[PDB]
Design a protein around this ligand. Structure first.
Ligand SMILES: CC(C)(Oc1ccc(-c2cccc3ccccc23)cc1)C(=O)O
Ligand SMILES: CC(C)(Oc1ccc(-c2cccc3ccccc23)cc1)C(=O)O
Lengths: 250, 251
């Protein structure tokens, strides 16, 4: 009934707030928008960054660090989705493994506008053109920027995004899953809760449910495109015995 | 009004029939060995291939059929209300990015786990036979079978597919589009039409609408993979001619 759907929605919203550092609502206030309580430090050039083992590699590695960190926040959020911990533990691991990249790029949009991205929990702001100003690394944020511009045109808020992220985790078509049935049964429930949420939250945005789902197609293409860049960078340099243990962590 | 959505659904179903020679309904009647009205001849090896008469031959068959399919899809496209009224450059762009996604959607209608109908249903070519084709060509069809088997478990019929196919063409998040808003206004209507159609045609089937739209992710991947395998073929087969139309669509 509408009752357990709204219950599910509020549950997810509550744990999404608890699990992640900067909400979209706060990121929007910082960006383009209102509140400049404390302006973020802006990174627009090589100087700016320093004023903030090596620049272009420094920045791409920094994004990896945050993303490893984010995997744990996503994990904790996953385990708050009703039914998730009851799944086969191999399937939990699989769902997280193939889901975290799509989740990261989804949420990255919350931190982006067409001009740049908030980092360090909104304390910083790296400009889009400074990012594109790199060498075989000026290639890696631009498709995220192009995706975010289109995705943010849907004007979702955190309550919408909480359910959407849960939908992504409970996919069903991840390779190697052992028991697809309960996963799809949970996702069917989450899709219902999502549909309702979007109808109550955006009553005059017609077919917002459908439009948001079609965005999954662009999301997977981003992820695919990102892993192939990663494979190229794994041909920039791999041999060095000065962070073997840090290499491990990533 | 739901009434307007029903008329649009009827209209699109109607054009689909008139545009596409072999419907899913006919494909299923052929495939199910309980209607012996006219059974297909089955191609499962090279001698049955020669009885029912290599890899290049088969794939250029596929190439010619695809170009004709583009024609039929193009014909169907003009019947979608609002489509011919769009900026022409966008009409080209919509077709360019839509055509292959639709071909693999419809291809599934002619497939089961064991093979695919060919030559307007007169032939059936085995999945194993296609998989054993020489090294580059043996990998072309297998991901389409994979898609088709899970897509076919949605159990869509032609009146469903007519609207879904229209939804695909009228995307708008396609690259290079000049006027996105009028494209999205039309898709928005196709989507309402699709949503109603599935809930009436499949009352017991929970969130079929969402699960169908998720399938759009899979069609993208198929196209992407097929493209990268075509550029392999282009280099190992310098003597094989890719069709100019198909060439213009791929970039
Ligand atoms: C889950 C998410 C979106 O994870 C992020 C991952 C990477 C970045 C990021 C993106 C681009 C450059 C960066 C440089 C240093 C640190 C982080 C980045 C921002 C957020 C977040 O922090 O909300
Ligand atoms: C739109 C569609 C799906 O177009 C087709 C495209 C390719 C094939 C096909 C697929 C695989 C092998 C073939 C060999 C000879 C001729 C055609 C094929 C069948 C149909 C159709 O005819 O319904």
């Amino acid at each position: 009934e509408s009752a357990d759907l709204r219950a599910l929605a509020k549950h997810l919203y509550d744990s999404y707030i608890k699990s992640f550092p900067l909400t979209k609502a706060k990121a929007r206030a910082i960006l383009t928008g209102k509140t400049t309580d404390k302006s973020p430090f802006v990174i627009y050039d090589m100087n700016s960054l320093m004023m903030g083992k090596e620049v272009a590699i420094r920045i791409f590695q920094g994004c990896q660090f945050r993303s490893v960190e984010a995997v744990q926040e996503i994990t904790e959020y996953a385990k708050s989705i009703p039914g998730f911990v009851n799944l086969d533990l191999n399937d939990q691991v699989t769902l997280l493994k193939y889901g975290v990249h799509e989740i990261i790029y989804t949420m990255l949009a919350s931190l982006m506008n067409k001009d740049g991205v908030l980092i360090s929990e909104g304390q910083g702001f790296m400009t889009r053109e400074f990012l594109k100003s790199l060498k075989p690394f000026g290639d890696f944020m631009e498709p995220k920027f192009e995706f975010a511009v289109k995705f943010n045109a849907l004007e979702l808020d955190d309550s919408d995004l909480a359910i959407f992220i849960a939908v992504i985790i409970l996919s069903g078509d991840r390779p190697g899953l052992l028991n697809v049935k309960p996963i799809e049964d949970i996702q069917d429930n989450l899709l219902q809760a999502l549909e309702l949420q979007l109808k109550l939250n955006h009553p005059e945005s017609s077919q917002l449910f459908a439009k948001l789902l079609q965005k999954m197609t662009d999301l997977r293409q981003i992820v695919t495109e990102h892993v192939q860049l990663l494979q190229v960078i794994k041909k920039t340099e791999t041999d060095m015995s000065l962070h073997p243990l840090l290499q491990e962590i990533y």
